Structures are given as C-alpha cells and as structure tokens.
C-alpha cells in the first residue's frame, strides 16, 4: 500500500513474538482465574490489584494491535489485518477491553465486563495446531444440520402438544389449613394436587388442596406458556429429571394417560436422536479416514 | 387384486364387522352402568336410563 | 350418532372398493372407521364421568361391548390403512406411490 | 473484644481470632441456628 | 518363573485388596509381614535375571523400565514411615504408590500390551483436541464466575454446594453440568439468583443450554474420533408336527402363557383374579405336555429347556424361589422363531469380541477402588446434626428448624449415620465407583469426599477440595474413554461383516420402476390441476401452515383462539376438496401424504364441531391441528431422506428389539415377585408413582432405570429393611421384613444388560446404514438416479412401460455427473 514510512515496527515483528505474548495472555488468564467474585459490591485487597493489572494487559495487546494494524494497510487495504480470520477476534477483544475500561472511568455496568473471558481464546491463535483442530469441528457440524432441523421441530411439536394438554394444571397444592405453607414430608418435594379428579389427594392431616401455587420447581417447570413448555420439553429430552415432570403431571391430571406423552418423547427425542448423531458423526469420521488412507 | 382380495385384508375386514355390530348395539343396549344409593338399582345407556 | 355415521360412510367405501379395481378406495374407508372408533371412545368419556357425578357404580354388560367395538374398529382401521399403503421402500430405488 | 464468625463460608478467620486473642477477649463460631444459644451466652465465662 | 512371578503378584494383590476399616489386628500383622518379604522377593527378581541379561539390556525395554521404580519407591517408603512422615493422608499417598506393582500380570499378556501400543498414542496425537476441551471448560467456568459468582446468597438454610464462588468450584460445577448430572438444579439456582421465572431471570438458562449442547457435542466428537482411530490401529496393524400349523399354534400359545405371568397380583396372595390364572396355568401347561411327545415319540439341547419349563410348571402345577424359575417361559420362543435365534447367537458371538476390553476395565476399576479405600476409608460417617463430630457426641436429641425459622423447631434424636455408598472395603468401593461411572449421584459422593475429615470423625465443609481430582480422573478414564473405546470396538467390529458404488447403481438401473403422475385430460379440470401444482400455491400452503403453528403458540394461561381455529380448518378443508377435484379422487389417494392430509382435515372438522356442540349445550381431538406441521416434512427432502433411511433399518431389525422387550418382561416379572410387597410411602423412592405392584408400573420403573435416573436410590429402596404393604400377609411384629438384599444383583445386572443390548441396537441400525452415512454426496450416487426417475416420469404421466424416443432430447436436461 503506502510506502515504508510508517513501518518502523516491522523490524521486530518476526522476532520470537509468540513466546512472549503467549506468556502474557497466560498471565492474563491466571489473573482472571484468581479473581474472587464477592456479593453486593464487596471487594478485597487482591481484587483491587487485579484491576490495576488489567491496565498492563490492556496496554500490551493494544499497542501490539496497533503494530499489526498499521503494518498492514490503514485498516485492511486488501482485507489484510481485519479480514484475516483469527485477527478480527483479537481486534474485537482489545477493542471491547479499552472501550469498557474507559467507560468504567467515565461514570466516575458489568454486562460488558463478562466479555473479558474471551481473552483465553487468544491461546488458540497462539498455536496453529489448535487453530487447525478447532476448524475441524465447524467442518463436521454441517452434516449435523438435518438432524438439528429435526430436533428443533420435534421440540416445537412436543412443546405445543404439552401446551395444549397441560396448560394451567399444576397450580394446586395442599397447604396447611388456614396457612400459606406447603405441606410436605421429609424428602418429598412440593408436588401438585387434585380436588375432584383422578389426580392425587394429599394425606397430611392438617392440609387442604387449593390453588394459587406458582408451580413445581419454584415456578419454572410447567407448560403454562410456549417458553416454559419449550424449556421443560428440552429438559426432559436430555433425560434429566423427566420422571419428575411425568410424576407431577400424574399428580395433577391423572395416572393413566400422561405416560404416553413422556415415553414417546424419551424414545423419539432422546434415543432415536442420539442414535442419529452417533451414526452421522461416526460415518463422517470413517469417510475422513478413508479419504486419507488413499494418501 | 393385491390389497382387495388378499387374505390378510379380508381377515381385518372380518375383524371390523364385529366392531360394527357391537357398536350399533352399544348405542341401543343400555347395559353398562348401575347406580345404588342405598332397592333402586339403575341401568344407564345412551338414550334412556 | 357421529360414530355410527362414520361406520355407515365407511362401509360404503369398503364395499365399492371391490369392483372396477378400485383398491385405492380402501384407503379412505379405513380412516373413517378409525374416527368412528375414536368417536366411540370419547362417547365413553362422557358417560364415564357422568357415572362419577351421580352410592355405588359398576359396568356390567355393554361396557365390554363398547370397549371391544372401539378397540377393534380403531386397531382394524389402522391395520387396514397400513395394509393398503404399499410399503416403506426399503431400497434406494423403491418409492412410495410407485407404478404398481 | 469478643469476635464471632457466623455462617459457613470460605473466608480467612485468622485476623478475627487475632483480634480476639490480643484484646483480652474470645473467639466464637456460629455455623447454624443450633449454635446461637450456646455461643451467645458463653462470654459470661470470660467476663467472670 | 513365568508363573511363579505371577503367583507372587496374585498373593500381593489378594493382600492389598483385603485392607478394610476396623480390620482385625492379625490382618494388619499379615499385611506387612507379607510386604517386606514380598518386596525382597521382588528384589531377587531384579537381581538374578538382571544379571542373566548382562549389563545394558535392563534399560532397552520399557517393560522392566519402571520395575526399578517399584523397588526404589518400596524401600524409600519403608524408611519414610520410620520417620516423622505423619498426617495419614501423607502416609497413605505412598500406599497408593505401592499399588503400582500390579502391572506385572499385564506385563505378561500379548494382547493386553498390544492394545496400548496405539491407545497411548491416542491421547498423544489428540492432546491438541483434549486441550480445546480444557479451554472450553475454562472459558465457561470464567463466565459462570461472572454471571453467578457470589450470587447464590439465598437467605434460606438449604446448602447449595454446586455454585460458582471461586475457580475450583466453578470448574467442578461446569464439569458436572457437562456430565449432565443434576444440571437442572444448577440451572434453577441460576434462575433464582436472578429475578426468578420472569423476563430478566430466565435468560440465564441460555448459558446452560449452550454449556450442555455445544459442550457435550465437542467432547463426544473428540472421544469418538479417538476411539475409532485407536481401534483402527488394533484392527489394521493386526491385519497387516413339523408343519406350520403346529409351530404357529404353539408359538401363539407361549405368548399367552407368558402374558398370564404379567397379569398377576403380588400383594394379594390368592386374589379374586389370581386363581383364574391358576386355572389357566393348567390349560397352558397341558397343551404343552402333549406336544413334548409329538416331538419325541417321533424322536428319542434346546428342547430340554422346554421340558424343564413344563416340568417346573407341573411340580408347581425355600420352594418359593422356584416361582422365579418360571420366567423362562418366553425364553422357549427362541426355539420356533428362527430369526430370533440368529440374533441371540450373533450377540453371543459379539460378546467374545468384547472380552479383551472388559478385563482391562475391570482391573482399572479394581485399582481405583483400592486407591479409594486408601483415601476415604472410615471417612464417610456423619451425625444427624453436623455439629457433633464423633460417635460419642452424636447421642441425645437436637432441634431442626423448618424453613430455617428459629421460632419453629422440632425435636429429632441424633444418630451416627453411615453413608449408603462408601469406601470401607474394595467391594463397597467398587459399588460406589460403579454408581459414579453411570453419572448418577456422583456430585453427592464428591461433596462428601471433599468434606472427609479423619478416620472416625464427621465432615468438615470444604476440607479437601483437591479430592475432586480423584473423581475427575476416574470419570474421564472410565466414563469418557474406556466406555468410548468399548463403543468404538463394537462399531469397528460390526463394520467388517457388514466396486461398491458401481454395484449399487447397476443394481439400481435394473430393478427400478417408472413413476405415475396422474396428469389428467379435460382442460376445464386441467385448469384447477394447473394451479394445484404451482410452486406459488404450495408455498402459500406452507406459509399458512406456519401461520397456524405460530397461532398455536400464542395460547397461555390467565376468544380469538377458536375463531382462527375454524378459519384455518376452513382453509384446509377447501384446499383438500380443490385438490380432490383437480385429481378426481384417484391421483389424490395415491399419495400417502394426501392420505395424511385427509386424516388431518377430517380430524380438524370433528374437533371444531365437537367444540361448538359443547358450547351449544374430548381433550385429544385438539391434537389434530398440531399434527398439521408434520406435513411440513413433504418439502425438506434431506430431513425426509434421513428419517426414511433410519426408519427403514429400524424396521429391518425387529429381532434385536425383541431382545430388549424380553429383558424388560423377564426383569419386570422377577421384580414383581422379589420386591412387590414394599409399602408405598412418599419421601421414599418406592411410592405411588414408582413401584412394583403391577406390571405396567414395574415396566415403567425399569424404563426409568434404563434412562439412568436415580436408579441407585431405587436400589436402596429395596434392601431388607422395608415396611410391608398393609394388604399383604405377615406375622404381627414382623413388619419391616419386605425387600431383599438381592436388589444389588437385580439392578447392577439389569443396568449392565440394558446398557449392552441397547448399544447393540444402536450399532446394527448404524452399520445397516453405513452406505448412506459414508457417502460422498457429489461424486456419484442414487440421488442422480432419482433425478433421472423424476424427469423420466415427467415425460411419462402414466407408466405404460417406457416412452417415445425424442420426448432423446431429455439427455440435455441432466446434470453432467449423469448426463
Ligand atoms: C417431527 C417428526 C415427528 C415428531 C413427533 C411425532 C409424533 C408426535 C408426538 C405424539 C403425541 C404424543 C401422544 C399425545 C400425549 C397424550 C398424553 C395424554 O393423553 O394426557 C393428557 C390428557 C389428559 O387431559 P384431561 O382431559 O384428563 O384433562 C382434563 C380432565 N377432564 C377433561 C376430564 C376434565 O389425556 C387426554 O386428553 C386423552 C388422551 C388419550 C388418547 C391419546 C393417546 C394417543 C395419541 C396419539 C398416539 C400416537 C403415539 C405416538 C406416535 C408415534 C410418534 C413417535
Ligand atoms: C453446536 C451446538 C450449539 C448449541 C445450541 C445452543 C442453543 C441455544 C439456545 C437458544 C435459546 C433461545 C432463548 C431465547 C428466548 C427469548 C427470551 C424470551 O423472551 O422468552 C421468555 C420465555 C417465555 O416468557 P417468560 O418471560 O418465561 O414469561 C413470563 C411472562 N411474560 O421464558 C423462557 O423460559 C425462555 C427459555 C426458552 C429456552 C428453550 C430451550 C429449548 C431449545 C433447545 C433445543 C435445541 C436442540 C439443539 C440440538 C442440536 C444438535 C446439535
Ligand atoms: C427406539 C430406541 C429404543 C426402543 C427399544 C424398545 C424398548 C421399549 C421399552 C420401553 C417400555 C416403556 C413402558 C412404559 C409403559 C408403562 C405404562 C404405565 O406406566 O402406566 C401406568 C398406569 C397406572 O395404572 P395402574 O398401575 O393400573 O394403577 C392406577 C389405577 N388407578 O397404567 C395404566 O393406567 C395403563 C396400563 C396399560 C399400558 C400398557 C402399555 C404398555 C405396557 C407395557 C408395554 C410393554 C410390555 C412388555 C414390556 C416391553 C417394553 C420394552
Ligand atoms: C399414517 C400415514 C402415513 C404416514 C406418513 C406418510 C408419508 C410417508 O411415509 O412417505 C414415505 C417417506 C419417503 O418415502 P420415499 O420418498 O418413497 O423414499 C424413497 C427414496 N429412496 O418415508 C417417510 O415417511 C420418512 C419418515 C417420515 C414419517 C413421518 C411420520 C408421519 C406419520 C405420523
Ligand atoms: C496409582 C498410584 C497413584 C496414586 C496417587 C494418589 O494417591 O492419588 C491422590 C489423588 C488425590 O489427591 P490428594 O492425595 O488429595 O492430594 C494430596 C494433597 N493434600 O487422587 C489421584 O489422583 C488418584 C489417581 C491418580 C492416578 C491413578 C491412575 C492413573 C492412570 C492414568 C492417569
Ligand atoms: C461470551 C460473552 C457473553 C457474556 C454476556 C454476559 C453479560 C450480559 C448480561 C449482563 C448481566 O450480567 O446483567 C444484566 C441484567 C441485570 O442483572 P444484574 O444487575 O446482574 O442482576 C439483576 C439486576 N437487574 O441481567 C438481568 O437483569 C437478567 C439476566 C440477563 C440474562 C443474562 C444473559 C446470560 C446469557 C449468557 C450466554 C453465554 C453463552 C455464550 C458463551 C460465550 C463463549 C465464548
Ligand atoms: C484429570 C484432570 C486434571 C484436572 C486439572 C485441573 C487443573 C487445576 C486448575 C487450577 C486450580 O486448580 O486452581 C486455580 C488457581 C487459582 O485459584 P486459587 O488461588 O486456588 O483459589 C483459591 C480459592 N479459595 O490457580 C490458577 O489460577 C490456575 C488457573 C489457570 C487458568 C488459565 C489457564 C490458561 C490455559 C489453560 C491450560 C493450563
Ligand atoms: C440449526 C438448528 C438450531 C437453530 C437455533 C434456533 C434456536 C431457536 C429456539 C429458541 C426458541 C424459544 C423461544 C422462546 C420464546 C417463546 C415466546 C415466549 O417467550 O412467550 C410466549 C408468548 C406469550 O407468553 P406471555 O409472556 O404469557 O404473553 C402474554 C403475557 N401476559 O407466546 C408467543 O408469542 C410465542 C409464539 C411463538 C410460536 C412459534 C411456534 C413455532 C414457530 C416456528 C415455526 C417455523 C420454523 C422455523 C423455520 C426455519 C426453517 C429452516
Ligand atoms: C483381571 C481379573 C479378571 C476378573 C474378570 C471378572 C469379570 C467380572 C465383571 C463383572 C462386573 C463387575 C462390576 C460391578 C461393580 C461391583 C459391584 C459390587 O461389587 O457390589 C457390592 C455389593 C455390596 O456392596 P455394599 O454397598 O457394601 O453393600 C453390601 C450389602 N449387601 O455386593 C453385591 O451384591 C453386588 C453384586 C454384583 C452383581 C454383578 C452383576 C453383573 C452382571 C453383568 C452381566 C452383563 C454384562 C455384559 C454386558 C457388558 C456391556 C457393557
Ligand atoms: C465390568 O467393567 C466395569 O466395571 C464397568 C464400569 C465400572 N461402569 C459401567 C457403566 C460398565 N457397564 O457395564 O456399562 C462397565 C464398563 C465401563 C466402561 C467400559 C466398559 C465396561 C464394561 F464392563 F461393560 F465392559
Ligand atoms: Ca441423572
């Protein structure tokens, strides 16, 4: 591009730069690790000296970004620095860093503070073996596209079925008579209850089954709208606590029908699906081994 | 004649006719429910109890 | 009444499917039976819950008749539809709705 | 000085016992509700 | 010496695997008066055959390279216990090094040392993919330390051990969410730390949704890769009356004989129904006692099983164990069913393949159990209240506070309790590690081994947070690596007994047939036929379907939700009749998708008229409007192709799923017999929802255990301490005698069996499909040969065989890969 009037830094660019910026980003990772998160605006001594250290780590990466940006075009000039694959990531990193660091000393919140955990990704840039390893997974997840478009649609179908069948059913429970305390037993978790139905009537002596109960898992597991129904369907599909949802529906509406909904979702959603991905990926491994066996 | 005069479709169309007759009688035979408050035994149906 | 109407409309297609090589006609007929069956079941529902809103209760004779007619019609329509629908291809060339 | 370290936490207690052992006082730990009664009536032992 | 040197290592193993808690003193005496002598006997074997192999050949083979390490560590450790090296943790972390000598029987087997010749290179080559997993874990722990760090400060008294308060704890939490165990409770704590089930809070679920899926995926991939490559190395380097009447009538009567075992009542001894099946038993027995002579009056290994079955059905017409021996009644169907015995024997020949990888795993399990006994033996005791740290202090009563309210307390007697899964011997250690390797209850063993204080004292919160390493290596070796090379073993072995593309296409271009299109005459009805198959029309149909789907999601809890239902019902029933008129009810019912559409339309009509009949005066008829977006699978040809491809091979192998249903049947009957009288009390794991009283309930319990739920808690809900059901029969005062300690043999076996057969069904269905999965989608294939079929049936509305010559101009419409 422009003449060699600005490239006063391309002389030490080819020095062993990797064996110093790697140790710097590793020390940055360590200073990120030993940080202690304290509740409600509290801090200690070591947490104060680790924010003065984010000025030594944000000033090295930034001057190296300058050294690499002006050594190749104004910004790109041929899509050189910015459009280099693993040089845009580092730019966003050191461009959010300074941004939020000067923002923290302009109102003198913590949302952009959490973008500080992307700096550990720089180590992948540091070693090219990791760079080629990381690009193989995004190369092998394209055959898993017709499986994801099937899992998404199955989750959306079962969410709507559960929204039609169970919406607003797990809202009664048995409190103590005249109280707002749920009445349970030693290891029992608060489950739904039924009055005038095939559901469960609860047994504790001074207890009555009335409504106004936010739901089973503090109000998180229920088919009350599309978002929560999607959430509980997805949770069941991972085969984690699906029997709890089944049992709560059994307590709410009745024992004989609801299993059809959950044994079908666990067979189709979990076993059939994981069997699909265990075949599609092993087939991809086999074909990428066979194409290389001819080399 | 593959699906229409095979034996495996005729056995099923046989099994259908049993359901046909038992259903056309079930609408008319009120012999499926009793109630006894407690001698006033009842017999429910679809049209008249 | 709707269930018996479905049985009526299904027997027609079940019989007209025997002539003129109208085998395709056995595909809708089956389905009608299914709904008939299904209808019978929800019929059950109503009566059942009525029995538990009126004392003792007990189903003696015709509940078996209905619980048999429903399951037979339902399973038979489903299996008739499975037998009229040709086959899952099972081969890279075979296909559903293939020429004879 | 009587110092009390309350709760089940991961913080350093050395300085608190030092404040206790230096100024003629005592150091108590209250991890739960069941310890409150007996640990809050025991300073009368030191005062005596 | 080839066997005398294995005799000494076996004598040493049987002595290091006999150290338990509270062992007799003579046992402690034996265990070291048999260690110094055996260490010196390991010393003579590093001298005489050292001198036999000269000078420099005791460093050429890595085999005897670490054997000098054994002697160095042994003597150095002998002289460090006569020193101030106390702190039993320190004295025992060398007795774990003492275990490093068992590798002398692994020293001696060919195939047990041949497999590691590339298994060790597996990690070494993949060390840059395992590192990406480590970096993923570290980034997600550093993100969890920001989102939920110091935010689990709920005022209640309930302990939440899996938090993100510091970096080791965040690592433990992220690893536990990765293994999948109890991740939903971590998510619930994360949701309650924020607002709650509201708009700000619930978005913190995304974190977990990204941590599980994209975290499982990567991991899985890595392991799979490793497995396949390491297995290739171990597979390529080594490479270089007698009619149908009788049989079909007896076969349909063994199923009745079996289902008479299903329908039963274990609680009611002779229930009103039970003697009906007792009478049917004589019928099902005497129809079989005749056909044992119609088979061996014509004649004099598989029918002796049947004769024993009928003999035990005759002698029955303590001894009550014989009633468990009548569960092989369906095991005789492997006689007549010929396709059944083929897979029953293909499974017994597939077990011989996996016998090499089971012994190395069992040995790793044993050695990790020994390390566990050296670490956490005696340390899994506790008191009811966690303020008393000794069995002598844990006496009397204490108060418990409900909901953590200091003004609402109850009295509870305090008792010195032992954990249910502990590390006192190698049997208990192996059981604990077995429950850990299935990922169930492993955080409760972790946070209990972290609090381990001393040999007979109670826990201390966050005492030893480094103990987590013991639980994170074992999980990575056994549950992530050995289990994955087991699956790689079975998949690569199935791979073989399963050119090719030319063969497939020359078979295609022979047996394929033409396709019918139903292109009609009569331009007056050809008019509506033209607007029926327009891409614009079907795209309007697809858009209407997605509009109905988005209208189905708008419903919530606490009327324009039914008028639109009727409006869509009308749109679809008019589309159906218009398609019918354009196809004359002959081309319409030819397409299965049109059969499904007709099904949906009839169901929707019935639903709307039922709802307005109900408002003029069925919860499942409302499901037919949801089934509509299934016909959205008539457009996505890749998804439809994948679904058909897998459903084909799932239908091709029903005799491998028959094995699973037989396993479930047998185990459910045996469990109804063994533990079927236990009470149904809430707060326990045998309750109204999960029990053994009836056959459906037992089958659903076994399905829950198959899915790997808290099966190790049902295993403890049936162990000779359980209150009997009041309806049962038992002597007074003799109540807590239900349940048997046979549960450990019942569950541990079942899981294993249920994990084998399932894996089997996963591999067959995969290898039967290895054509479509290992296919280059560009070079060649049947998709082009279906392109040809389509463009050919275009010119040929009715099949009528083949077609005219010119319309030869079609060859200009083909892709160059084929045209
Ligand atoms: C994406 C490709 C395919 C993905 C999905 C493929 C299939 C789609 C999912 C299948 C639907 C699951 C079955 C519905 C769940 C029923 C639960 C239930 O009935 O309880 C609630 C309700 C309980 O509600 P309720 O009526 O008691 O509540 C109020 C009480 N009253 C009204 C009395 C005041 O049960 C019913 O309404 C009756 C249902 C009985 C009949 C339904 C069972 C048959 C359903 C279809 C069978 C097909 C099986 C699966 C197909 C194969 C797919 C793998
Ligand atoms: C390489 C693999 C990559 C890994 C993939 C990662 C998946 C990303 C997850 C995406 C999640 C999207 C969430 C965005 C929802 C928008 C937020 C919102 O407004 O909805 C709130 C919702 C309902 O409203 P709410 O606030 O609860 O109601 C209170 C009264 N107003 O309240 C809620 O509860 C919203 C929560 C919805 C969460 C649904 C989760 C189900 C989706 C998982 C299925 C995907 C399976 C992937 C399989 C692919 C295989 C490789
Ligand atoms: C794709 C990959 C994997 C594929 C591999 C194939 C293996 C599949 C294995 C999965 C089996 C899951 C079985 C789940 C069915 C359980 C039924 C159930 O839980 O219903 C409970 C309900 C309770 O009623 P009850 O016990 O009478 O008491 C209440 C009375 N007021 O009971 C009822 O009200 C109705 C009871 C009738 C239900 C019968 C239908 C199923 C029952 C058993 C089916 C299987 C039979 C043999 C076991 C084979 C299963 C493998
Ligand atoms: C009951 C009614 C029938 C169920 C839906 C009918 C749709 C159908 O089964 O069509 C066949 C479909 C693909 O078959 P085809 O295109 O012929 O594949 C040959 C390519 N070598 O094969 C498939 O169905 C693929 C799997 C989709 C099944 C959808 C389930 C719909 C029924 C619920
Ligand atoms: C086998 C000989 C190695 C035994 C080493 C050992 O005792 O393991 C200790 C470790 C838990 O660490 P810990 O002992 O608590 O740390 C002491 C700091 N106070 O727990 C462990 O790491 C035990 C497992 C370490 C290696 C066992 C098998 C390794 C096989 C491939 C790796
Ligand atoms: C990677 C980069 C992702 C980092 C994004 C995290 C920062 C965005 C959320 C900012 C935040 O933490 O809080 C904002 C807001 C207020 O929350 P706060 O004030 O802490 O407490 C309640 C008081 N309103 O929050 C709320 O009021 C409700 C909670 C907001 C939902 C938080 C969003 C979590 C989603 C994280 C997904 C991470 C997955 C990607 C992982 C990246 C891997 C490199
Ligand atoms: C078999 C599996 C083996 C398990 C390997 C786990 C490795 C241990 C991780 C480091 C560790 O355990 O401690 C982190 C420590 C900072 O935390 P610390 O000071 O211990 O906090 C005290 C809390 N009261 O010390 C650290 O901060 C080290 C954390 C390193 C994070 C950055 C690493 C950058 C690249 C990652 C690869 C190394
Ligand atoms: C590559 C594969 C993976 C790719 C990743 C994709 C990730 C997507 C998964 C995340 C989706 C979860 C969305 C969660 C939010 C749902 C809406 C919601 O949160 O609230 C429910 C809302 C009403 O709730 P409420 O707040 O009570 O309203 C009034 C309150 N007084 O009611 C609503 O308004 C919600 C209505 C939405 C209904 C939609 C149902 C289906 C629509 C999609 C079908 C089209 C398929 C996409 C086509 C793509 C083809 C390639
Ligand atoms: C190199 C050496 C050569 C040796 C090779 C021998 C190979 C044998 C491999 C078998 C697998 C063993 C792994 C199981 C872990 C051990 C379980 C155990 O020992 O349990 C201990 C239990 C008592 O423990 P505790 O908690 O103290 O309670 C006592 C109160 N009664 O006491 C018990 O009652 C437990 C009873 C154990 C029952 C085991 C049943 C296993 C049957 C599985 C067969 C199917 C496997 C094939 C499929 C594999 C595919 C994955
Ligand atoms: C016997 O080995 C074992 O102790 C096993 C442990 C400890 N855990 C579990 C879950 C097993 N299992 O049967 O699924 C086997 C295991 C585990 C990893 C690889 C192979 C096997 C094998 F045993 F099945 F071979
Ligand atoms: Ca689990």
Swiss-Prot record, chain A:
<feature type="disulfide bond">
    <location>
        <begin position="193"/>
        <end position="209"/>
    </location>
</feature>
<feature type="transmembrane region" description="Helical; Name=S1 of repeat I">
    <location>
        <begin position="16"/>
        <end position="34"/>
    </location>
</feature>
<feature type="topological domain" description="Extracellular">
    <location>
        <begin position="167"/>
        <end position="227"/>
    </location>
</feature>
<feature type="topological domain" description="Cytoplasmic">
    <location>
        <begin position="128"/>
        <end position="144"/>
    </location>
</feature>
<feature type="topological domain" description="Extracellular">
    <location>
        <begin position="35"/>
        <end position="49"/>
    </location>
</feature>
<feature type="transmembrane region" description="Helical; Name=S4 of repeat I">
    <location>
        <begin position="109"/>
        <end position="127"/>
    </location>
</feature>
<comment type="function">
    <text>Pore-forming, alpha-1S subunit of the voltage-gated calcium channel that gives rise to L-type calcium currents in skeletal muscle. Calcium channels containing the alpha-1S subunit play an important role in excitation-contraction coupling in skeletal muscle via their interaction with RYR1, which triggers Ca(2+) release from the sarcplasmic reticulum and ultimately results in muscle contraction. Long-lasting (L-type) calcium channels belong to the 'high-voltage activated' (HVA) group.</text>
</comment>
<feature type="glycosylation site" description="N-linked (GlcNAc...) asparagine">
    <location>
        <position position="205"/>
    </location>
</feature>
<feature type="transmembrane region" description="Helical; Name=S2 of repeat I">
    <location>
        <begin position="50"/>
        <end position="70"/>
    </location>
</feature>
<comment type="similarity">
    <text>Belongs to the calcium channel alpha-1 subunit (TC 1.A.1.11) family. CACNA1S subfamily.</text>
</comment>
<feature type="short sequence motif" description="Selectivity filter of repeat I">
    <location>
        <begin position="238"/>
        <end position="241"/>
    </location>
</feature>
<protein>
    <recommendedName>
        <fullName>Voltage-dependent L-type calcium channel subunit alpha-1S</fullName>
    </recommendedName>
</protein>
<comment type="subunit">
    <text>Component of a calcium channel complex consisting of a pore-forming alpha subunit (CACNA1S) and the ancillary subunits CACNB1 or CACNB2, CACNG1 and CACNA2D1. The channel complex contains alpha, beta, gamma and delta subunits in a 1:1:1:1 ratio, i.e. it contains either CACNB1 or CACNB2. CACNA1S channel activity is modulated by the auxiliary subunits (CACNB1 or CACNB2, CACNG1 and CACNA2D1). Interacts with DYSF and JSRP1. Interacts with RYR1. Interacts with STAC, STAC2 and STAC3 (via their SH3 domains). Interaction with STAC3 promotes expression at the cell membrane.</text>
</comment>
<feature type="repeat" description="I">
    <location>
        <begin position="2"/>
        <end position="285"/>
    </location>
</feature>
<feature type="binding site">
    <location>
        <position position="240"/>
    </location>
    <ligand>
        <name>Ca(2+)</name>
    </ligand>
</feature>
UniProtKB/Swiss-Prot annotation, chain B:
<feature type="topological domain" description="Cytoplasmic">
    <location>
        <begin position="1"/>
        <end position="10"/>
    </location>
</feature>
<comment type="similarity">
    <text>Belongs to the PMP-22/EMP/MP20 family. CACNG subfamily.</text>
</comment>
<protein>
    <recommendedName>
        <fullName>Voltage-dependent calcium channel gamma-1 subunit</fullName>
    </recommendedName>
</protein>
<comment type="subunit">
    <text>Component of a calcium channel complex consisting of a pore-forming alpha subunit (CACNA1S) and the ancillary subunits CACNB1 or CACNB2, CACNG1 and CACNA2D1. The channel complex contains alpha, beta, gamma and delta subunits in a 1:1:1:1 ratio, i.e. it contains either CACNB1 or CACNB2.</text>
</comment>
<feature type="transmembrane region" description="Helical">
    <location>
        <begin position="11"/>
        <end position="29"/>
    </location>
</feature>
<comment type="function">
    <text>Regulatory subunit of the voltage-gated calcium channel that gives rise to L-type calcium currents in skeletal muscle. Regulates channel inactivation kinetics.</text>
</comment>
UniProtKB/Swiss-Prot annotation, chain D:
<comment type="similarity">
    <text>Belongs to the calcium channel subunit alpha-2/delta family.</text>
</comment>
<protein>
    <recommendedName>
        <fullName>Voltage-dependent calcium channel subunit alpha-2/delta-1</fullName>
    </recommendedName>
</protein>
<comment type="function">
    <text>The alpha-2/delta subunit of voltage-dependent calcium channels regulates calcium current density and activation/inactivation kinetics of the calcium channel. Plays an important role in excitation-contraction coupling.</text>
</comment>
<comment type="subunit">
    <text>Dimer formed of alpha-2-1 and delta-1 chains; disulfide-linked. Voltage-dependent calcium channels are multisubunit complexes, consisting of alpha-1 (CACNA1), alpha-2 (CACNA2D), beta (CACNB) and delta (CACNA2D) subunits in a 1:1:1:1 ratio.</text>
</comment>
